[PDB]
């Protein structure tokens, strides 16, 4: 019995100790598991973070190399321009000095025939653009090329048409006023394509193409000319021109419609007509012109006394072609029949159709007389029917048109041409163009652009790389203590 009691006492001690050791390990395991949880959360986040870090460094690297490609190019252009700067500037200064001297010399002849009364250089080179592209908007009607062709083949222009000639001033617009003549967009017509061997009254040294529209008073067509290759302002390339043509409500042509033929070559101008087959007395047709020239960057060019040519201002015994309501200042060419009166530019004192008639000095068309044929782009004395307008600013305008003489002055103030009636009706149409082809003689031209100081590009900011962090090592397994040995009797 004594042993048994002893054994039981030892047994109790064992059981209690065993319990302690177990609870101790259980708590030890609880901690280990908690450590494992944290370690796993740390690595999981560390992995996802390292992956992200890997991505960012890749992007930063790529974006950087992308900036270097652009930099490498801009830097190459900068160094090149800086190298050329002095040579370009020299050409500029040299020409400016040359122009200054030419102008001083011209001062001595400013009152001689063909000379601009107020000596000036022409900083606007704008006179030939055969490859120009035309795009039109309008609040009027676009006319099918086939409709224009059919119109030329009928009525008053038929005789010429059958002779392979497109006589614009004979075109009867009566046949362009039907709904079936309206096109869904601009269409070109002229002596090209299947009519490449035909003649037109617009030019006799080149093929011409034009888009057509039918407009009423107050309606307009806005032409955007691009792909210009030979035009400049102060030597800087002119890449685009936006020109808006509006039918002047004050036009007195009979009827409500006007045919507008806009040539793809902007320097060729436009043909405007309300001619319906018969001449009209007390008639007129005026077209308002609003235009802006743009540089290569699409920025409007702010003219500084550019010279706009206003030529071929015909004045017959019963008809006056004129320019009015214009921006800028009129500059007269000495000896020219063209002057300014009552805010209008035209042959103010004499006619200019035939020498000896109405005080005209020369005949507009070629004949047996010396100096005849002044009305042509190449005539040496084409200045006889021309003048100029000095313009400044990015937005300029001028209204050009033809009107019966009786609308401008009483018959009593008119030149008399024996055998001709000054009240004779006329056709309400006109061809005209506004460009930089000044007809005055020896006008100095600006061809060298003043270079701007090259702007050095900035090397791209170095990429910011981040390092990936080392993954955390797993927790160490705890060393659980042994359990006591049960006692024996």
Q: Which is nearer to Ca ion, 276 or 314 (CB)?
A: 314
- Shortest Å distance, C-beta 312 to Ca ion: 3
Stretch that binds Ca ion, among 178-186, 250-258, 306-314, 480-488 (CB under 5 A): 306-314
Question: Which runs of consecutive H residues, i.e. helices, occur in 260-414?
Answer: none
Q: Could you tell me where the beta strands, DSSP code E, fall in 97-198? A: 124-125, 133-138, 141-142, 165-166, 188-190
- Shortest Å distance, C-beta 132 to Ca ion: 21
Question: What phi and psi, each to the nearest 5 degrees, are found at residue 230?
Answer: -125, 15
Number of residues that bind Ca ion (CB under 5 A): 2
- Shortest Å distance, C-beta 393 to Ca ion: 26
For 25-46, give one letter per residue: b (16+ CB within 10 A) or e.
beeeeeebeeeeeeeeeeeeee
For residue 314, state whether it binds Ca ion (rule: CB under 5 A).
yes
Give the whole-angstrom CA distance, residue 81 versus residue 196: 44
Give the position of tokens 């007509």.
273
End-to-end CA distance of the chain: 11
- Shortest Å distance, C-beta 322 to Ca ion: 10
Q: Which is nearer to Ca ion, 283 or 312 (CB)?
A: 312
Q: Which is nearer to Ca ion, 284 or 312 (CB)?
A: 312
Q: Which is nearer to Ca ion, 92 or 353 (CB)?
A: 353
Q: Which residue is nearest to Ca ion (CB)?
A: 312
Q: Which is nearer to Ca ion, 280 or 316 (CB)?
A: 316
- Shortest Å distance, C-beta 358 to Ca ion: 16
Strands 338-341 and 429-432: unpaired
Stretch that binds Ca ion, among 75-83, 168-176, 309-317, 329-337 (CB under 5 A): 309-317
For residue 337, state whether it binds Ca ion (rule: CB under 5 A).
no
Q: Which is nearer to Ca ion, 214 or 323 (CB)?
A: 323
Cβ contacts of residue 327 below 8 Å, gap of 6+? 389, 391, 393, 395, 396, 397, 398
Give the position of tokens 């791209």.
460
Return the DSSP state at 131. T
For 94-105, give one letter per residue: b (16+ CB within 10 A) or e.
ebeeebeebeee
Q: In this structure, are residues 221 and 260 in contact, taking their beta carbons and an 8 Å threshold? A: yes
For residue 254 the two structure tokens come to 């009979």
- Shortest Å distance, C-beta 109 to Ca ion: 27
The torsion region of residue 426 among left (phi > 0), alpha (psi -120 to 50) and beta comes to beta
Stretch that binds Ca ion, among 105-113, 175-183, 271-279, 311-319 (CB under 5 A): 311-319
- Shortest Å distance, C-beta 365 to Ca ion: 12
Near Ca ion in 171-200, by CB under 5 A: none
Question: Which runs of consecutive H residues, i.e. helices, occur in 153-258?
Answer: 158-161
Q: Which is nearer to Ca ion, 239 or 273 (CB)?
A: 273
Q: Which is nearer to Ca ion, 267 or 314 (CB)?
A: 314
Near Ca ion in 346-375, by CB under 5 A: none
Q: Which is nearer to Ca ion, 99 or 405 (CB)?
A: 405
- Shortest Å distance, C-beta 361 to Ca ion: 17
Stretch that binds Ca ion, among 102-110, 288-296, 314-322, 465-473 (CB under 5 A): 314-322
Give the whole-angstrom CA distance, residue 475 versus residue 480: 15
Breaks (C-N over 2.5 A) in the chain follow: none
- Shortest Å distance, C-beta 99 to Ca ion: 30
Coil, helix or strand for 188? Answer: strand
Coil, helix or strand for 103? Answer: helix
For residue 120, state whether it binds Ca ion (rule: CB under 5 A).
no
CA-closest candidate to residue 295, choices 305, 287, 303:
303
Check whether 312 is labelled as a binding-site residue.
Answer: yes
Check whether 314 is labelled as a binding-site residue.
Answer: yes
Check whether 360 is labelled as a binding-site residue.
Answer: no
- Binder among 167, 312, 382, 403 for Ca ion (CB under 5 A): 312
Give the whole-angstrom CA distance, residue 249 versus residue 355: 35
Binding residues for Ca(2+): 312, 314, 321
Interface residues with Ca ion (CB under 5 A) are 312, 314
The binding site consists of 312, 314, 321
């Amino acid at each position: 019995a004594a042993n048994e009691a002893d054994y039981q006492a030892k047994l109790t001690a064992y059981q209690t100790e065993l319990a302690r050791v177990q609870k101790a390990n259980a708590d030890a395991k609880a901690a280990y598991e908690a450590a494992v949880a944290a370690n796993n959360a740390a690595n999981a986040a560390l992995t996802a973070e390292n992956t992200a870090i890997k991505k960012r460094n890749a992007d930063a690297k790529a974006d950087y190399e992308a900036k270097l490609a652009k930099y490498q190019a801009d830097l190459a252009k900068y160094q090149k321009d800086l190298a050329d700067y002095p040579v370009k500037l020299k050409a500029y200064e040299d020409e400016q000095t040359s122009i200054k001297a030419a102008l001083a010399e011209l001062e001595k002849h400013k009152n001689e025939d063909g000379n601009l009364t107020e000596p000036s250089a022409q900083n606007l080179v704008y006179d030939l653009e055969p490859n120009a592209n035309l795009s039109l908007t309008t609040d009027g009607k676009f006319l099918k090329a086939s409709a224009v062709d059919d119109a030329f083949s009928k009525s008053t222009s038929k005789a010429k048409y059958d002779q392979k000639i497109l006589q614009l001033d004979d075109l009867d617009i009566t046949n362009l006023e039907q709904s079936n003549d309206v096109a869904s967009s601009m269409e070109l017509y002229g002596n090209f394509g299947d009519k490449a061997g035909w003649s037109t009254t617009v030019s006799n040294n080149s093929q011409v193409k034009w888009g057509s529209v039918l407009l009423e008073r107050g309606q307009s067509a806005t032409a955007t000319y691009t792909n210009l290759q030979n035009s400049y302002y102060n030597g800087k390339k002119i890449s685009k021109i936006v020109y808006k043509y509006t039918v002047d409500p004050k036009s007195k042509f009979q009827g409500q419609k006007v045919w507008l033929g806009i040539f793809t070559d902007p320097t060729l101008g436009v043909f405007a007509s309300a001619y319906t087959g018969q001449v009209e007395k007390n008639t007129s047709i005026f077209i308002k012109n609003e235009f802006t020239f743009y540089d290569e960057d699409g920025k409007p060019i702010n003219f500084d006394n550019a010279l706009l040519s206003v030529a071929s201002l015909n004045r017959e015994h019963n008809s006056i072609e004129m320019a009015k309501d214009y921006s800028g200042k009129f500059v007269k060419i000495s000896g020219s029949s063209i002057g300014e009166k009552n805010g209008m530019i035209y042959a103010t004192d004499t006619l200019n159709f035939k020498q000896g008639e109405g005080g005209s000095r020369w005949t507009m068309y070629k004949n047996s007389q010396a100096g005849s044929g002044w009305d042509s782009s190449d005539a040496p004395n084409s200045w006889y029917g021309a003048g100029a307008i000095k313009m400044s600013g990015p937005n300029n305008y001028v209204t050009v048109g033809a009107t019966s003489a009786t609308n401008v002055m009483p018959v009593s103030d008119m030149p008399v041409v024996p055998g001709k009636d000054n009240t004779d009706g006329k056709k309400p149409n006109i061809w005209y163009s506004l460009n930089g082809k000044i007809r005055a003689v020896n006008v100095p031209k600006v061809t060298k652009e003043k270079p701007t100081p090259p702007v050095k590009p900035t090397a791209p900011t170095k990429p910011t790389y981040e390092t990936e962090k080392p993954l955390k090592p797993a927790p160490v397994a705890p060393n659980y203590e042994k359990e006591p040995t049960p006692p024996t009797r």
